[PDB]
Write an enzyme that holds these catalytic residues in place. Sequence first.
Site, PDB file in Angstrom:
ATOM      1  CG  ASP A 244       0.590 -11.288   1.565  1.00  0.00           C
ATOM      2  OD1 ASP A 244      -0.174 -11.782   0.617  1.00  0.00           O
ATOM      3  OD2 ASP A 244       0.184 -11.424   2.784  1.00  0.00           O
TER       4      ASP A 244
ATOM      5  CD  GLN B 292      -7.644 -11.150   2.127  1.00  0.00           C
ATOM      6  OE1 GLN B 292      -8.791 -12.097   2.231  1.00  0.00           O
ATOM      7  NE2 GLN B 292      -6.563 -11.372   1.875  1.00  0.00           N
ATOM      8  CG  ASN B 293      -2.286  -8.272   3.758  1.00  0.00           C
ATOM      9  OD1 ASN B 293      -2.578  -8.762   4.886  1.00  0.00           O
ATOM     10  ND2 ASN B 293      -1.555  -8.903   2.735  1.00  0.00           N
TER      11      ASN B 293
ATOM     12  CB  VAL C 260      -7.226 -13.970  18.133  1.00  0.00           C
ATOM     13  CG1 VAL C 260      -7.952 -15.432  17.578  1.00  0.00           C
ATOM     14  CG2 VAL C 260      -6.309 -13.936  19.463  1.00  0.00           C
TER      15      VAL C 260
ATOM     16  CE  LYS D 209      -1.344  -8.158  13.147  1.00  0.00           C
ATOM     17  NZ  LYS D 209      -0.528  -8.068  12.145  1.00  0.00           N
TER      18      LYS D 209
ATOM     19  CE  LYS E 127      -3.129 -11.319   1.793  1.00  0.00           C
ATOM     20  NZ  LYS E 127      -3.511 -12.943   1.999  1.00  0.00           N
TER      21      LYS E 127
ATOM     22  CG  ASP F 291     -10.049  -5.943   5.845  1.00  0.00           C
ATOM     23  OD1 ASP F 291     -10.787  -5.953   4.580  1.00  0.00           O
ATOM     24  OD2 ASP F 291     -10.251  -6.627   6.911  1.00  0.00           O
TER      25      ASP F 291
END
Lengths: 5, 258, 296
Positions: free
Chosen positions: C127, C131-132, C17, C33, C129, C86
């Site tokens: 990685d 979302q990143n 979360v 974070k 993508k 994002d």
Amino acid sequence: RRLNF
Amino acid sequence: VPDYHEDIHTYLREMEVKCKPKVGYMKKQPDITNSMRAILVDWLVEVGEEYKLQNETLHLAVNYIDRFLSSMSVLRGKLQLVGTAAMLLASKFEEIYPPEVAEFVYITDDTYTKKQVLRMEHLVLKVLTFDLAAPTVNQFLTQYFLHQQPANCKVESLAMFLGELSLIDADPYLKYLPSVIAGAAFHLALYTVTGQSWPESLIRKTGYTLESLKPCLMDLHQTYLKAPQHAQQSIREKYKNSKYHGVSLLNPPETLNL
Amino acid sequence: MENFQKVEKIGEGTYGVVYKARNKLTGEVVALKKIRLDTETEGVPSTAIREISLLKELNHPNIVKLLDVIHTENKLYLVFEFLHQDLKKFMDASALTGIPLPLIKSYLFQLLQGLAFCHSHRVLHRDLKPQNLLINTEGAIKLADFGLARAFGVPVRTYTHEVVTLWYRAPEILLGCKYYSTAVDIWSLGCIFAEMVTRRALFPGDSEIDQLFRIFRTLGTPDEVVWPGVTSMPDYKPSFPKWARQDFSKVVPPLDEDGRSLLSQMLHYDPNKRISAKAALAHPFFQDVTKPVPHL
């Protein structure tokens, strides 16, 4: 091992 | 061939100056000695073999240790716990899957608890300020290897070997940047296997002449010569395996021609 | 942690979360974070080890900033610049209309700049993508989420079977190559570029082999001429159906010829010929790049 100093 | 060999090499040369341990640190430690550091690192080579860790983890771990020991006084009885937490941290940084923390407890013969290893991990991270991506001999070797004509397995192995031997002895090696040690070790390995020499390609890339490598080389030629006599032997045993073409058996040359 | 006031959760990932928070003293809005650093299990997770040490080195306008790390005995807090969403969520909310071409061009340009910076400091992201990738409301986009990223001072050894998404994986990796190169990052970027343009994933496969075959169905089946070595690759098979290279005009229709040129260099099968980030920035595709702002 324990290192024996 | 990278667009950034050059940028990377350049940048690695920037970072090694910054990630340097203090030269004189061991003289300022009340309770520990260069000879204990040597027992410690030699042991870390065995741990590396037993868990089949990469050579880079080993090199990373010794960097952490030396920087740590450069701001924190340590007592004989804790040195191994520093080493252990360094090797864990290094494994976490560099390995695909690190050994489980318990393994790390095990390799000491339950002489520290998991909780002690986990809080020393935290303490190491804080002293190093989470700065873990340290340049190593191993990294600079790997770049330099791109410039061999042609690629020679035995030379690569034997340079690796020489690079590792240097981790063992603060002794002299602490006063050389990794870019220099890797220089010396590439020459000495080249010379030893073929009679060839530190190539102009790298003379231009590194701006290191053979001359400039002279002091490191001399030291490293000595270390190579006496290697079979050294109190620590873990790296020789390691470098007998055929994986490495047995190079740590080959006969070092008794002069260097400089 | 006392100067931070939690405002709302804004999603999770590795770590756990993410909270939007505000600095009670300066006004700054950040992303928090938090990692519940138990001292019985495994200690500090390596994703955290890597993100913190790698991000701490990469200061660049198109890479998320790590502002602070806050160390207590039982908690690790990480403080990032806040970016409100994002590319994925943006893409879903732009489905129907599409993301306008000129923002697709700006994003790609920015992402190439960030990638280039990473690669010239020996970092692989690995990685990439949607979302990143984080955007703000003034038209910036930034690489985020470096928990898988790796220093490649030495070559980076491939995950036997990798926990990374499938859709953006390069065909050298599917074929059981042993090292990564910066080319995987370019290949992912290529797919994202396509995805923005067509509003759907370029290569949405449901297992390793279906993923290859979807790539082959589009760019055609590699052989030793396109890709010196393929037949000698661990996972390659004489029996691979032999498809032909269907034309990019039907793969990415809305794109002009400079677009198709760039996509297709980003999508080169042979890792050694795939265009680097540095070079892609030189491409004539970007001669009329601007910085428009998304309507979120």
